[PDB]
């Protein structure tokens, strides 16, 4: 393990890549249901 | 692992870890694996979502493998730039900026009947100053004809504002005659290919002019760090670096699961081994293994 | 007194100084790219960081580092794309042969300077009797592969390969980047391919030939594949499949040089299946359903999910103006089977929309009790580039890989269903054209 | 006493009369029984689709503008609650 | 690079541009004798046309190693030159330690000399903080995170100020 290959090397370290996948895969499940729940209110005028 | 779609958008990427997951994929499928069937659902506000978060996952790792070209002479490494983040937006989905900055002014205003609504829906992707100069001619055409200026393009007040705005375009820098024939085409091709290499001609300069823009800005940014970086003592940077570093791994070590926070902390775990690979023999750097 | 680990150990301490100069540096690509080196990528990776490094370049330095780089197969777009810059200021400076070399590296290595080939095909249509057809042939290569639709210097190359005879190798080079600009003329094509009779000098002209035709939607010759027949064992597999793929697009049925084709690549997917793009294993499958010739079993099985992976990730990243065809073409065709009303429109737009047996999604797909059709929509981009605007050779490969799943494919055009001034029109073609592939429906 | 009940119903284009047999489906449920609906009918370009039926008590928003800028509301709300 | 390469032995090099390095080919039809010289090596090879039209088969993909990543790099790399210049301006400096003698402190004002040891001091300072440079890593990741919020653009990571004003003449200049 003191030598690495190069597809390993060739990542970038610190990128929000992951930050993006965590959010996407708690934001589009969220906003599916959300879509399949979705009924508008009835605003009253007044 | 993926999603299935998280590999549809790794497949034409040349990022390493997208990669190597498009390739485990490939093992994995070549080992007898069914593909899983792809989805043939979810409305365009939701599809369009996921294609959005994405194309981000292809652009953050992208973006971090491009060097910026800071402190160089002549346009060709800032050409180089223009043109890595030109395949990046390519690799990620995106088509070309000038066909995908249209498609977000055909979308923000796409129902809208007068000029100043065009101009007050498109305000965060034009620019401020050019943004001012077309509010001035819409004004003052406005002023001239004694109505609101309407977005059909067929009434007279639209082409006394269409003239004007060309000339304002044209004074700014923008060959509009060039943009507009490129965008509208001609009958025979070698007009077309006359126009097209104008349009070519102002559009490298163009991407050019604002690749150039950002390698200053960030130039400008490192040299002002710097500056107030270098006026502290040594032991004051010591510190403030210090906390901040333990700060950033108290942060990474408070999500535990996550797994953005276990990339995180392997990648410091990599950056050791860098530096104990360098340390091992620093004429030849990095171990690779080959 | 022959030794080629000394000699490399030397080019590597030549190379590891603090200040190489660019003839130094050219002059040590030169050498690597002449002793084969392909093991050792950290002698390139060196050389290639001093290229970078380098500021003094003259004409032929410039020359003789880019000729290496390109003969060498050595990819790293951040140094030869940074090496536009001595290009372009020493551009006046160069050659014809000089401007050729440079103008094909750059332009193979995919470097986007509109500046470069404007200028680089304004030399080259300025004086053409300066140049050689070798020379154009470059130059076209490299304002091709460089995404530049430059067709002065298509018709003037054009003009050039009618007049004189040229080398199979500048044929298929020149073939090559015709396919990549999707010029299907049959005037400049024909004299590239009447010179296609004096043997092949490599197997890979023969194989970016066929590549070439079959991407234009030409019809094979017979020297091309007899010459890709005899020596199918000197391609990489990535350029036996674009061979293959070629050969089954333009419609060949020898079966033999399909057969020596699929043994050179088939035992390296069996070695690595991650080794080629998925692209290429959905040319591969192409070619095997097309041909008809046989895989093995994990292999055709492999090159199948491939396609439609393949197939799945054309259609996620499909660009806005097909998103809008494909919706006009569903719209058209849920018009011509019975909908005069917006929600059965909308209905039937939504039910059109299918999963194919390869796991990838068919847009409009219609069944009526066991018969299919397949609308396929085209867009402006898969059309030939040319006047007469054909769709191109792959059009031609989905439809016979999705009429190998069962599907009659009825083909929708962008320029001629667009053409049409009203949606009653648009559906009458679209249901012309099915009923011209398929006359149950 | 007659269970009529008058309301405005504004669409971004002119209707089908299958779409205005299916807006009328829609819209018997805000009612408050089986009454009968007398509806007129309204162009918005600024609605992208669905319809806004415009009572004198009350207003349903069913168009397409307000329910991207719902979908925008909520993706931004949770994109920041993350 | 491409699939399909179409340079080998056909308009080759012939002879080394640099004296470092000597090359000499002897190209037959279609075949050529490449001897390539450098100090006490030599190699006298023979190569065909065919092999190196086969040497662009297989691609070397050339890849940076980097600690963190490339864009980190070239940012700690421009905080290293810049780091640099202010180090030309601090090794342009006066040598004050000529003038640290009893001499000179007896024959001066006191507070001039308080002032003199204290620019000295100063000096140290300096000194001492241009030669950090194992911060200059730090400093870079200081500069790379609202560089990558301005590359995630909803448009395009490409998409600048110019493009957008000239697609908006178009879009303006053309009707809707």
């Given at each position: 393990?003191?030598?690495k290959?190069?597809?390993?090397?060739?990542?970038?370290?610190?990128?929000?890549?992951?930050?993006?996948?965590?959010?996407?895969?708690?934001?589009?499940?969220?906003?599916?249901?959300?879509?399949?729940?979705?009924?508008?209110?009835?605003?009253?005028?007044? | 692992?993926?999603?299935?779609?998280?590999?549809?958008?790794?497949?034409?990427?040349?990022?390493?870890?997208?990669?190597?997951?498009?390739?485990?994929?490939?093992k994995?499928?070549?080992?007898?694996?069914?593909?899983?069937?792809?989805?043939?659902?979810?409305?365009?506000?939701?599809?369009?979502?996921?294609?959005?978060?994405?194309?981000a996952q292809?652009?953050?790792?992208?973006?971090?493998?491009?060097?910026?070209?800071?402190?160089?002479?002549?346009?060709?490494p800032?050409?180089?730039?223009?043109?890595?983040?030109?395949?990046?937006?390519?690799?990620?989905?995106?088509?070309?900026?000038?066909?995908?900055?249209?498609?977000?002014?055909?979308?923000?205003?796409?129902?809208?009947?007068?000029?100043?609504?065009?101009?007050?829906?498109?305000?965060?992707?034009?620019?401020?100053?050019?943004?001012?100069?077309?509010?001035?001619?819409?004004?003052?055409?406005?002023?001239?004809?004694?109505?609101?200026?309407?977005?059909?393009?067929?009434?007279?007040?639209?082409?006394?504002?269409?003239?004007?705005?060309?000339?304002?375009?044209?004074?700014?820098?923008?060959?509009?005659?060039?943009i507009?024939?490129?965008?509208?085409?001609?009958?025979?091709?070698?007009?077309?290919?006359?126009?097209?290499?104008?349009?070519?001609?102002?559009?490298?300069?163009?991407?050019?002019?604002?690749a150039?823009?950002?390698?200053?800005?960030?130039?400008?940014?490192?040299?002002?760090?710097?500056?107030?970086?270098?006026?502290?003592?040594?032991?004051?940077?010591?510190?403030?670096?210090?906390?901040?570093?333990?700060?950033?791994?108290?942060?990474?070590?408070?999500?535990?699961?996550?797994?953005?926070?276990?990339?995180?902390?392997?990648?410091?775990?990599?950056?050791?081994?860098?530096?104990?690979?360098?340390?091992?023999?620093?004429?030849?750097?990095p171990?690779?293994?080959? | 007194?022959?030794?080629?680990?000394?000699?490399?150990?030397?080019?590597?301490?030549?190379?590891?100084?603090?200040?190489?100069?660019?003839?130094?540096?050219?002059?040590?690509?030169v050498?690597?790219?002449?002793?084969?080196?392909?093991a050792?990528?950290?002698?390139?990776?060196?050389?290639?960081?001093?290229?970078?490094?380098?500021?003094?370049?003259?004409?032929?330095?410039?020359?003789?580092?880019?000729?290496?780089?390109?003969?060498?197969?050595?990819?790293?777009?951040?140094?030869?794309?940074?090496?536009?810059?001595?290009?372009?200021?020493?551009?006046?400076?160069?050659?014809?042969?000089?401007?050729?070399?440079?103008?094909?590296?750059?332009?193979?290595?995919?470097?986007?300077?509109?500046?470069?080939?404007?200028?680089?095909?304004?030399?080259?249509?300025?004086?053409?009797?300066?140049?050689?057809?070798?020379?154009?042939?470059?130059?076209?290569?490299?304002?091709?592969?460089?995404?530049?639709?430059?067709?002065?210097?298509?018709?003037?190359?054009?003009?050039?390969?009618?007049?004189?005879?040229?080398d199979?190798?500048?044929?298929?080079?020149?073939?090559?980047?015709?396919?990549?600009?999707?010029?299907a003329?049959?005037?400049?094509?024909?004299?590239?391919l009447?010179?296609?009779?004096?043997?092949?000098?490599?197997?890979?002209?023969?194989?970016?030939?066929?590549?070439?035709?079959?991407?234009?939607?030409?019809?094979?010759?017979?020297?091309?594949?007899?010459?890709?027949?005899?020596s199918?064992?000197?391609?990489?597999?990535?350029?036996?499949?674009?061979?293959?793929?070629?050969?089954?697009?333009?419609?060949?049925?020898?079966?033999?040089?399909?057969?020596?084709?699929?043994?050179?690549?088939?035992?390296?997917?069996?070695?690595?299946?991650?080794?080629?793009?998925?692209?290429?294993?959905?040319?591969?499958?192409?070619?095997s359903?097309?041909?008809?010739?046989?895989?093995?079993?994990?292999?055709?099985?492999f090159?199948?999910?491939?396609?439609?992976?393949?197939?799945?990730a054309?259609?996620?990243?499909?660009?806005?103006?097909?998103?809008?065809?494909?919706?006009?073409?569903?719209?058209?065709?849920?018009?011509?089977?019975?909908?005069?009303?917006?929600?059965?429109?909308?209905?039937?737009?939504a039910?059109?929309?299918?999963?194919?047996?390869?796991?990838?999604?068919?847009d409009?797909?219609?069944?009526?009790?066991?018969?299919?059709?397949?609308?396929?929509?085209?867009?402006?981009?898969?059309?030939?580039?040319?006047?007469?605007?054909?769709?191109?050779?792959?059009?031609?490969?989905?439809?016979?890989?999705?009429?190998?799943?069962?599907?009659?494919?009825?083909?929708?055009?962008?320029?001629?269903?667009?053409?049409?001034?009203?949606?009653?029109?648009?559906?009458?073609?679209?249901?012309?054209?099915?009923?011209?592939?398929?006359?149950?429906? | 006493?007659?269970?009529?009940?008058?309301?405005?119903?504004?669409?971004?284009?002119?209707?089908?009369?299958?779409?205005?047999?299916?807006?009328?489906?829609?819209?018997?449920?805000?009612?408050?029984?089986?009454?009968?609906?007398?509806?007129?009918?309204?162009?918005?370009?600024?609605?992208?689709?669905?319809?806004?039926?415009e009572?004198?008590?009350?207003?349903?928003?069913?168009?397409?503008?307000?329910?991207?800028?719902?979908?925008?509301?909520?993706?931004?709300?949770?994109?920041?609650?993350? | 690079?491409?699939?399909?390469?179409?340079?080998?032995?056909?308009?080759?090099?012939?002879?080394?541009?640099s004296?470092?390095?000597?090359?000499?080919?002897?190209?037959?039809?279609?075949?050529?004798?490449?001897?390539?010289?450098?100090?006490?090596?030599?190699?006298?090879?023979?190569?065909?046309?065919?092999?190196?039209?086969?040497?662009?088969?297989?691609?070397i993909?050339?890849?940076?190693?980097?600690?963190?990543?490339?864009?980190?790099?070239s940012?700690?790399?421009?905080?290293?030159?810049?780091?640099?210049?202010?180090?030309?301006?601090?090794?342009?400096?006066?040598d004050?330690?000529?003038?640290?003698?009893?001499?000179?402190?007896?024959?001066?004002?006191?507070?001039?000399?308080?002032?003199?040891?204290?620019?000295?001091?100063?000096?140290?300072?300096?000194?001492?903080?241009?030669?950090?440079?194992?911060?200059?890593?730090?400093?870079?990741?200081?500069?790379?995170?609202?560089?990558?919020?301005?590359?995630?653009?909803?448009?395009?990571?490409?998409?600048?100020?110019?493009?957008?004003?000239?697609?908006?003449?178009?879009?303006?200049?053309?009707?809707?």
């Amino acid at each position: 393990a003191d030598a690495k290959a190069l597809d390993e090397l060739r990542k970038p370290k610190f990128s929000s890549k992951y930050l993006i996948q965590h959010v996407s895969q708690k934001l589009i499940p969220a906003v599916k249901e959300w879509e399949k729940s979705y009924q508008p209110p009835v605003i009253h005028l007044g | 692992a993926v999603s299935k779609k998280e590999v549809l958008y790794f497949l034409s990427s040349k990022d390493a870890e997208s990669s190597t997951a498009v390739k485990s994929y490939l093992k994995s499928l070549y080992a007898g694996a069914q593909v899983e069937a792809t989805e043939t659902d979810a409305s365009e506000l939701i599809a369009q979502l996921e294609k959005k978060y994405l194309s981000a996952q292809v652009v953050e790792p992208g973006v971090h493998n491009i060097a910026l070209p800071l402190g160089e002479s002549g346009s060709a490494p800032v050409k180089r730039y223009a043109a890595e983040l030109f395949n990046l937006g390519a690799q990620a989905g995106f088509e070309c900026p000038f066909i995908e900055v249209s498609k977000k002014f055909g979308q923000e205003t796409a129902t809208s009947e007068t000029v100043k609504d065009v101009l007050n829906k498109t305000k965060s992707y034009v620019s401020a100053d050019y943004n001012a100069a077309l509010n001035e001619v819409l004004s003052s055409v406005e002023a001239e004809i004694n109505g609101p200026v309407l977005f059909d393009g067929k009434t007279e007040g639209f082409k006394k504002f269409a003239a004007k705005a060309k000339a304002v375009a044209v004074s700014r820098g923008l060959p509009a005659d060039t943009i507009l024939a490129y965008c509208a085409g001609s009958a025979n091709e070698d007009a077309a290919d006359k126009v097209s290499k104008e349009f070519f001609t102002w559009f490298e300069s163009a991407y050019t002019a604002d690749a150039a823009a950002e390698v200053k800005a960030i130039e400008a940014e490192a040299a002002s760090i710097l500056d107030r970086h270098l006026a502290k003592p040594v032991a004051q940077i010591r510190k403030e670096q210090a906390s901040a570093y333990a700060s950033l791994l108290k942060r990474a070590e408070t999500a535990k699961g996550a797994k953005w926070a276990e990339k995180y902390l392997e990648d410091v775990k990599a950056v050791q081994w860098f530096d104990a690979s360098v340390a091992e023999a620093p004429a030849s750097g990095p171990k690779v293994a080959a | 007194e022959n030794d080629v680990p000394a000699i490399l150990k030397e080019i590597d301490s030549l190379v590891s100084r603090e200040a190489v100069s660019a003839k130094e540096v050219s002059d040590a690509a030169v050498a690597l790219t002449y002793l084969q080196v392909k093991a050792n990528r950290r002698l390139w990776g060196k050389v290639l960081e001093k290229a970078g490094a380098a500021q003094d370049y003259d004409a032929a330095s410039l020359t003789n580092l880019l000729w290496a780089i390109n003969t060498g197969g050595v990819e790293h777009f951040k140094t030869v794309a940074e090496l536009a810059g001595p290009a372009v200021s020493l551009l006046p400076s160069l050659s014809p042969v000089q401007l050729s070399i440079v103008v094909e590296a750059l332009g193979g290595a995919g470097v986007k300077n509109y500046e470069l080939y404007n200028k680089a095909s304004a030399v080259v249509v300025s004086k053409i009797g300066e140049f050689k057809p070798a020379e154009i042939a470059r130059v076209l290569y490299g304002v091709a592969f460089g995404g530049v639709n430059d067709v002065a210097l298509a018709k003037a190359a054009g003009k050039v390969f009618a007049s004189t005879e040229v080398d199979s190798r500048t044929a298929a080079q020149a073939l090559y980047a015709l396919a990549k600009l999707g010029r299907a003329d049959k005037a400049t094509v024909d004299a590239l391919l009447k010179s296609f009779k004096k043997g092949t000098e490599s197997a890979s002209d023969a194989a970016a030939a066929s590549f070439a035709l079959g991407s234009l939607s030409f019809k094979a010759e017979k020297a091309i594949v007899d010459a890709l027949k005899a020596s199918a064992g000197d391609l990489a597999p990535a350029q036996a499949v674009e061979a293959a793929y070629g050969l089954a697009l333009s419609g060949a049925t020898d079966a033999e040089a399909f057969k020596a084709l699929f043994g050179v690549v088939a035992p390296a997917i069996e070695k690595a299946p991650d080794a080629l793009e998925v692209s290429s294993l959905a040319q591969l499958h192409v070619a095997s359903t097309i041909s008809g010739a046989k895989l093995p079993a994990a292999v055709g099985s492999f090159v199948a999910k491939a396609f439609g992976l393949a197939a799945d990730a054309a259609r996620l990243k499909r660009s806005s103006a097909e998103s809008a065809l494909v919706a006009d073409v569903a719209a058209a065709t849920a018009v011509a089977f019975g909908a005069q009303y917006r929600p059965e429109v909308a209905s039937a737009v939504a039910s059109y929309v299918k999963t194919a047996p390869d796991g990838s999604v068919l847009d409009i797909a219609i069944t009526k009790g066991d018969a299919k059709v397949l609308v396929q929509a085209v867009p402006s981009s898969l059309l030939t580039s040319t006047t007469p605007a054909k769709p191109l050779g792959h059009v031609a490969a989905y439809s016979k890989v999705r009429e190998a799943q069962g599907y009659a494919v009825a083909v929708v055009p962008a320029n001629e269903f667009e053409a049409l001034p009203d949606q009653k029109a648009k559906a009458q073609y679209v249901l012309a054209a099915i009923k011209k592939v398929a006359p149950s429906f | 006493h007659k269970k009529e009940v008058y309301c405005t119903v504004i669409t971004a284009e002119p209707l089908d009369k299958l779409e205005r047999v299916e807006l009328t489906k829609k819209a018997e449920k805000f009612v408050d029984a089986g009454f009968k609906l007398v509806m007129q009918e309204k162009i918005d370009k600024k609605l992208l689709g669905g319809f806004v039926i415009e009572f004198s008590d009350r207003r349903v928003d069913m168009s397409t503008a307000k329910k991207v800028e719902e979908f925008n509301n909520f993706v931004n709300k949770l994109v920041l609650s993350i | 690079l491409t699939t399909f390469t179409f340079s080998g032995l056909q308009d080759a090099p012939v002879a080394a541009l640099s004296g470092s390095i000597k090359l000499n080919v002897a190209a037959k039809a279609g075949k050529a004798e490449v001897t390539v010289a450098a100090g006490a090596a030599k190699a006298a090879t023979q190569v065909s046309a065919a092999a190196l039209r086969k040497l662009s088969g297989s691609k070397i993909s050339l890849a940076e190693v980097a600690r963190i990543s490339v864009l980190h790099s070239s940012i700690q790399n421009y905080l290293l030159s810049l780091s640099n210049e202010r180090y030309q301006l601090l090794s342009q400096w006066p040598d004050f330690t000529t003038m640290y003698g009893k001499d000179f402190y007896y024959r001066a004002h006191p507070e001039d000399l308080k002032k003199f040891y204290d620019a000295a001091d100063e000096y140290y300072k300096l000194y001492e903080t241009v030669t950090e440079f194992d911060s200059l890593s730090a400093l870079a990741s200081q500069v790379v995170p609202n560089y990558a919020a301005r590359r995630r653009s909803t448009v395009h990571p490409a998409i600048g100020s110019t493009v957008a004003d000239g697609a908006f003449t178009n879009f303006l200049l053309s009707k809707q």
